[PDB]
Design a protein around this nucleic acid. Sequence first.
RNA 1: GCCGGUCCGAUUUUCGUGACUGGCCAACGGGGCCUUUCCUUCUGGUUUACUUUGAAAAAAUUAGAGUGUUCAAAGCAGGCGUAUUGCUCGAAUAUAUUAGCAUGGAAUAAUAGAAUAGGGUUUGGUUCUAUCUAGGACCAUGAUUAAUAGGGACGGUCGGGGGCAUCAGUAUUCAAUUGUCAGAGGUGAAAUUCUUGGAUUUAUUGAAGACUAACUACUGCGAAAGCAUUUGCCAAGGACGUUUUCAUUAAUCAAGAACGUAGGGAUCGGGUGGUGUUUUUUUAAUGACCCACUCGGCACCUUGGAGUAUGGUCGCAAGGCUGAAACUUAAAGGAAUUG
Lengths: 127, 134
Amino acid sequence: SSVLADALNAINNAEKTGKRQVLLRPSSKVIIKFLQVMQKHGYIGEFEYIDDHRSGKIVVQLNGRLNKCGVISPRFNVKIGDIEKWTANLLPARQFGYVILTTSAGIMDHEEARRKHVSGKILGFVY
Amino acid sequence: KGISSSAIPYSRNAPAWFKLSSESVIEQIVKYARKGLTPSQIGVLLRDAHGVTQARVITGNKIMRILKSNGLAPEIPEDLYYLIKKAVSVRKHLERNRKDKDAKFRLILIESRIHRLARYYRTVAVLPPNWKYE
RNA sequence: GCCGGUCCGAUUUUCGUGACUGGCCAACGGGGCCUUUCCUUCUGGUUUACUUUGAAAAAAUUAGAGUGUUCAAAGCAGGCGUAUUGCUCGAAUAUAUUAGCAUGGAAUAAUAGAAUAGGGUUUGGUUCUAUCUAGGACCAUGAUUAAUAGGGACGGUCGGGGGCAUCAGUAUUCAAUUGUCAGAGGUGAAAUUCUUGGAUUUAUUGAAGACUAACUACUGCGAAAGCAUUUGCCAAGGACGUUUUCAUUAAUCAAGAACGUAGGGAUCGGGUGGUGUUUUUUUAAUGACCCACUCGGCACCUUGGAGUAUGGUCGCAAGGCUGAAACUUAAAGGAAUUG
């Protein structure tokens, strides 16, 4: 399967149930920098990457603020004059929420993407 | 299915109650190899003879590369040879008494599981190709 | 920045300043050096998809712009001067890109990719120290982690899993030999059949094939259909155990092939720990029960039709005591009949 999609499904349905500390077994540095930028936006609390050599596990002490995360499995090129269309098609509002894209610095959201004036492909959305 | 496997620890060095040198383990494993024992049996007889964990920890590398370095390489790998030996044994039993339809089923399954690994070994090219199980 | 000192003046310590000196300490930056140790392997005699470009861009094309065609539909002014080197302005604004021309930077997703692993020959032959040594050549080797992805080894096991032999049981049938006498069978009743050449029943056997009563459960196994006597052989398989090995070998299915939402209790198989009874002790082996944990199982418990109506279209009970009509007509019937 897709490790990023299964990780974000893990924290999504654990938040939907209503737990606090979620274990997340298959980790990678894409998921690390993903939920690093979402904790910069304060959508989870702190977390931890316990390092055993095989894959490393993730435990997130999320508080209450997520309602839906996720990815988009075709990671296609998206121009700067199209992230407004993608925000309008993915989120319930303009500034309510974010959508994070893979770009030439890499795990920026769309606010930081229009600030730095770069773009790339879409890997996930969070609101 | 079920899980039942080893749990190699977090440390990656000789466990410091070791009281034995490094090349002595190399001499021990080439001694067992010249006795004619398969690498997995070298590994278990080295877990139990003198207290090593495994050779990638205690020596500089794994037993396959250290036996290729000492010149006692196998011409076919362990799992390939063992599946071939199981296949010829169940073939001999079925030719002793052809009525064993469950042995016919298991021979078909072992033939499939050995042709999968033969496909892997040919596509990685570590045995010479044209090798297609006789 | 710390400290010692040559001094001037006071002093026979110590201070003011001006010089000037070195011993050291941190922050800056500059030039090198070590992290390509000293020794073997090239094609033959890193690149690609994102952002900013300019260049040539088709009038018409986009949208825009000021102007009283009397407004609008439409059309498209620079005009004044100082009509003399200048004003006040507007056809300023905005696509030719899916395709190209080439340029310039990093994550993702691909394409590559390190010239590492010798301080490994049996021999052959050269000279050089006071029997010990030095320096020449041939002859047998390919990047980290080990997924609660995968296959493989190994171990005590595990099963009414399979194949082949083998052992058994009392049934069932048949046969033999005994025994005694009129019934035996069979059904709701019968009947058929068997029977004094002794049926049924009894006892002692013997043969034949098939099947594995009770144990049998919400238990075990196998890919599925299925699989229950014992013992042995032949292989196989599953779970567990594992500080053993390989290194992505994985999954999914046409064609083909073989066979036919969460929680809890209990149980089976394996392992760990506990510490009582079963056990027992110098023959080997390593049982049962309880409790906790853990892994895997077969399982369990609790959260458009319905009607109705039809002058239509199509079929039809339709239509009368039969016999019985051209014939008022018989026999025999059904009708209702206390004649």
